[PDB]
Amino acid sequence: PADAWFVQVGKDLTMTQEEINQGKMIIKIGLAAVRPAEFIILQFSQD
Amino acid sequence: TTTYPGVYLSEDAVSSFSVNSAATAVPLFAYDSENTNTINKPIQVFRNWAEFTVEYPTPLEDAFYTSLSLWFMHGGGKCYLVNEANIADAVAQYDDITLIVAAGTDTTTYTAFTTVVGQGYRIFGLFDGPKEKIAGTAKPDEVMEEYPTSPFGAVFYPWGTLASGAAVPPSAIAAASITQTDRTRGVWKAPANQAVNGVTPAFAVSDDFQGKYNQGKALNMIRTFSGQGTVVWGARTLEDSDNWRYIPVRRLFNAVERDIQKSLNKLVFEPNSQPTWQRVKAAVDSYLHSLWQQGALAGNTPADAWFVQVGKDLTMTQEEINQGKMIIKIGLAAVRPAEFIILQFSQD
Amino acid sequence: PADAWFVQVGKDLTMTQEEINQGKMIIKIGLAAVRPAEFIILQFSQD
Amino acid sequence: APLSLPPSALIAGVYGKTDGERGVWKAPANVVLNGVSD
Amino acid sequence: VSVRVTNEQQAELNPKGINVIRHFSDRGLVVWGSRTQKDDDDWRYIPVRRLFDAAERDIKKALQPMVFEPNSQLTWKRVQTAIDNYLYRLWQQGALAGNKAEEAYFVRVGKGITMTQDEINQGKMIIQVGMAAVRPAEFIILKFTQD
């Protein structure tokens, strides 16, 4: 579940020293949701 | 396409393929155009002995009536009967002809035989011999220039006489020996020592008159022994070259390709790619491996007996792939008859 | 009586996969019959 | 009397089967025309 | 029958595969031959055609209730199992020509196998399934030998 989302907050990965002096506290998180299986195709073979 | 939501399903695109065996014996015979006691229809199709009797109710004496009665009596199957002006049409249509025998016709038959060879139909005829009684005083060659030299055919001299009725041309006697051979044990064995029944040869030839007619060309006499009788003797084709002698080694290559060419007609216009090359290579050698255990072609370590190769740079380089060509080559070593058996004594 | 006859039928001892797809079902059985004692020879000795 | 027909109509439908199972990259030749006299 | 067929033209009509109603003396009329029309080694037999035609129609009717569910991983193992327990019951009643191993089905629904990431976004699933049907046994060949 480190692959499913990520959260990061720091001092030099984001929001460097000058925009800390303006008060800003910026973060970013990103995650991958699920999607419906609208189309279901199925393949027959011989093996 | 994937237009609307729901459950779709697809199936496989292509399946496996393999070759089907053979037929190995469908002859067409030599009718005579000037003959009277017969039908004016050029092409007749006979399947067994039943309809031949209802078409011909009376026993006749002509060379064709004595020939089909000798074909069916030793088994036989689906055989045709065409006039001697329409061989070049009947072979190109019916797609299963193997033998062109001569029922007492020589002059106009040899031209129509070498015609369908000229287009490369991969056929094997067989001819008649001279009429009666080579005196044997001299002249070993002058009886042999009236026969078209080709690796297709033999002559079968001694003119068996069919002591029941009138004479029988020896093309019918040779064609009856092939019928009880391929049904019994394969096509790679020569129609050589399987005996025929009800036919006696008119002459007694020799032990040594076979000898001077064994080189150059292939008289292939019909000689009667003690015990086994009226048997055929000698299986040799018209040339003497070390690639093409021994009639069974000709018919082996003649019937190992008429089943591959028949099968690959449903594989043309297929994409010339990598999954094709590994599928034909894996389908041909599975037919040869079934043919190696049966004793048709000789050799241990069956990578030594044959070879199959197909690729991108070993054969058919990039420019002739762009022209569409798909060329292969396979090569195999067949068996040959043990015509001469010599044996050495010593003391050790 | 395993020596008198033999019967065998299978998948790779006989009738491999491609000729199964053509429908063929091939077998082979082999057996050794009896033969008449047409000639009877008999030997005398002294031991 | 049977009427003739220029074959540009029914040959469009045979491109609709080859792209179904085999795809675009297969040349339609061995496909069999479905329903004709001669 | 209307016209009496014999064995010598049975040889011609059994290729270009069409079937035949035969007449026998001891048992009367009987149907004969079970070959379909087009003659590649894919499907030349009636039951091999009709076995794949019935196995699809039963699984396609029951996947229709689940046609808008999310494409996560716990849905994949629940579908792959309900297909696994359908071919196994059909295998152990003598309809899939496999030996005493498992090799009659390879149903797989994963994401690393059989799919990848970019067709999840145009919502799809791929069910690679395959069987090994049984062929009818005709042309029984004896080939007696001496030893």
Side-chain angles (χ1 to χ4, degrees):
Chain A
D3 199 4
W5 67 89
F6 71 98
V7 50
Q8 63 183 358
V9 51
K11 194 260 189 299
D12 288 329
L13 55 93
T14 55
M15 58 177 180
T16 66
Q17 178 61 259
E18 63 92 18
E19 64 270 21
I20 298 170
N21 293 317
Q22 293 178 355
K24 301 287 181 66
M25 183 179 175
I26 76 103
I27 61 106
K28 55 171 65 65
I29 64 104
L31 64 100
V34 301
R35 287 171 178 86
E38 188 179 7
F39 300 143
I40 298 170
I41 64 103
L42 59 94
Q43 297 175 355
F44 290 105
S45 178
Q46 289 179 356
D47 193 0
Chain B
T1 187
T2 326
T3 59
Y4 60 90
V7 179
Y8 299 102
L9 55 84
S10 176
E11 283 85 0
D12 195 0
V14 71
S15 65
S16 65
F17 76 103
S18 179
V19 293
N20 299 115
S21 66
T24 316
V26 176
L28 58 82
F29 289 169
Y31 171 78
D32 196 359
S33 63
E34 57 91 22
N35 197 1
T36 62
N37 52 7
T38 173
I39 303 101
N40 290 319
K41 183 70 181 68
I43 296 97
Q44 289 82 14
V45 171
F46 291 157
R47 192 174 295 110
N48 54 2
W49 178 252
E51 71 271 11
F52 182 74
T53 58
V54 72
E55 186 68 31
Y56 289 156
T58 63
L60 297 175
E61 302 295 327
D62 198 357
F64 72 97
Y65 180 73
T66 59
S67 178
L68 281 84
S69 66
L70 195 273
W71 172 261
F72 282 152
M73 183 262 279
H74 290 87
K78 183 176 173 66
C79 64
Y80 294 163
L81 191 147
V82 296
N83 52 0
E84 70 273 28
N86 292 316
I87 292 99
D89 293 334
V91 178
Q93 294 180 357
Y94 290 158
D95 204 3
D96 56 356
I97 304 300
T98 304
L99 301 178
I100 300 171
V101 317
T105 60
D106 55 355
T107 298
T108 178
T109 305
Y110 298 163
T111 65
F113 171 71
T114 187
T115 304
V116 298
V117 174
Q119 290 89 20
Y121 281 167
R122 294 289 184 269
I123 204 164
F124 184 78
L126 53 92
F127 295 155
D128 293 332
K131 184 65 180 67
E132 53 90 21
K133 190 56 70 178
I134 297 101
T137 64
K139 70 275 293 177
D141 187 74
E142 65 93 19
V143 299
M144 297 305 291
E145 70 269 13
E146 290 83 4
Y147 293 157
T149 173
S150 65
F152 300 155
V155 287
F156 297 101
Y157 166 64
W159 277 92
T161 190
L162 202 280
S164 177
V168 168
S171 295
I173 299 170
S177 177
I178 299 171
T179 304
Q180 64 183 356
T181 300
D182 58 350
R183 185 178 64 245
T184 300
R185 46 179 296 163
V187 72
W188 56 90
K189 198 262 185 180
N193 276 319
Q194 297 295 320
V196 299
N197 292 315
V199 176
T200 61
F203 292 158
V205 45
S206 85
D207 186 74
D208 58 353
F209 190 78
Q210 182 72 41
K212 66 184 180 182
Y213 287 166
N214 211 169
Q215 78 276 15
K217 297 177 82 70
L219 264 301
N220 291 319
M221 283 74 166
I222 308 303
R223 189 170 64 189
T224 301
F225 293 100
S226 68
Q228 55 184 356
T230 186
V231 74
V232 307
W233 191 256
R236 187 177 295 272
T237 186
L238 287 172
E239 281 85 1
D240 287 335
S241 68
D242 288 332
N243 291 320
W244 307 107
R245 292 174 292 177
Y246 295 105
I247 296 171
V249 82
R250 175 87 280 283
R251 290 177 59 84
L252 193 274
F253 284 168
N254 199 2
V256 79
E257 56 90 20
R258 292 178 66 249
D259 53 354
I260 294 173
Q261 185 180 2
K262 189 261 290 180
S263 72
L264 291 175
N265 199 5
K266 66 182 179 66
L267 194 140
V268 298
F269 294 91
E270 203 273 335
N272 193 358
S273 65
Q274 181 59 254
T276 299
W277 298 344
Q278 57 88 28
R279 191 178 70 195
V280 177
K281 184 179 183 293
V284 171
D285 57 354
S286 178
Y287 172 66
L288 296 178
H289 184 79
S290 68
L291 196 61
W292 173 62
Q293 289 179 355
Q294 198 173 2
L297 54 94
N300 54 3
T301 176
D304 199 4
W306 67 89
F307 71 98
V308 50
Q309 63 183 358
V310 51
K312 194 260 189 299
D313 288 329
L314 55 93
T315 55
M316 58 177 180
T317 66
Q318 178 61 259
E319 63 92 18
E320 64 270 21
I321 298 170
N322 293 317
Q323 293 178 355
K325 301 287 181 66
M326 183 179 175
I327 76 103
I328 61 106
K329 55 171 65 65
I330 64 104
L332 64 100
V335 301
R336 287 171 178 86
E339 188 179 7
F340 300 143
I341 298 170
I342 64 103
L343 59 94
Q344 297 175 355
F345 290 105
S346 178
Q347 289 179 356
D348 193 0
Chain C
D3 199 4
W5 67 89
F6 71 98
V7 50
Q8 63 183 358
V9 51
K11 194 260 189 299
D12 288 329
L13 55 93
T14 55
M15 58 177 180
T16 66
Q17 178 61 259
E18 63 92 18
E19 64 270 21
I20 298 170
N21 293 317
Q22 293 178 355
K24 301 287 181 66
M25 183 179 175
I26 76 103
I27 61 106
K28 55 171 65 65
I29 64 104
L31 64 100
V34 301
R35 287 171 178 86
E38 188 179 7
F39 300 143
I40 298 170
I41 64 103
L42 59 94
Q43 297 175 355
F44 290 105
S45 178
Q46 289 179 356
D47 193 0
Chain D
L3 56 91
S4 296
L5 195 278
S8 67
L10 52 90
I11 203 67
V14 82
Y15 290 176
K17 290 190 286 185
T18 303
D19 55 355
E21 294 88 6
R22 299 298 300 269
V24 178
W25 58 90
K26 191 256 175 62
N30 285 318
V31 286
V32 178
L33 273 66
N34 191 0
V36 284
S37 289
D38 194 74
Chain E
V1 297
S2 179
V3 290
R4 186 175 177 87
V5 66
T6 56
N7 291 112
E8 61 271 14
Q9 69 272 21
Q10 179 63 39
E12 201 274 331
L13 274 66
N14 199 5
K16 61 177 177 64
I18 56 99
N19 304 117
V20 59
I21 302 297
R22 291 292 300 273
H23 187 276
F24 287 100
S25 178
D26 53 354
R27 60 186 298 167
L29 278 75
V30 67
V31 72
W32 194 258
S34 175
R35 300 181 70 185
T36 182
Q37 195 68 39
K38 62 102 172 181
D39 287 329
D40 56 352
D41 199 76
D42 192 64
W43 298 297
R44 279 185 292 116
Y45 287 150
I46 300 297
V48 183
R49 172 73 270 175
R50 289 179 68 247
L51 193 146
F52 287 168
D53 188 74
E56 61 88 18
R57 192 173 65 248
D58 293 333
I59 54 98
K60 189 265 294 296
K61 194 267 298 295
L63 287 176
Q64 199 274 336
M66 47 166 62
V67 77
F68 268 147
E69 278 72 358
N71 201 358
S72 177
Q73 202 274 333
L74 57 92
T75 301
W76 290 341
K77 62 99 177 178
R78 188 173 66 189
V79 172
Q80 191 268 332
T81 302
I83 302 299
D84 179 76
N85 288 319
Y86 180 68
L87 301 176
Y88 179 74
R89 183 171 64 244
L90 192 146
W91 173 65
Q92 58 92 31
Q93 62 185 357
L96 293 176
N99 201 356
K100 302 287 103 176
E102 52 87 23
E103 46 99 22
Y105 49 87
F106 58 98
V107 49
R108 68 178 69 90
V109 73
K111 198 268 290 293
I113 56 172
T114 206
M115 286 192 286
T116 178
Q117 178 60 254
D118 52 353
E119 68 267 6
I120 308 298
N121 303 115
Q122 298 93 20
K124 286 181 182 293
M125 290 177 69
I126 284 90
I127 316 289
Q128 286 187 358
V129 66
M131 285 177 276
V134 66
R135 302 295 194 274
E138 51 188 358
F139 312 100
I140 297 171
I141 297 171
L142 267 290
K143 59 173 68 64
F144 285 83
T145 185
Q146 187 63 255
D147 189 75

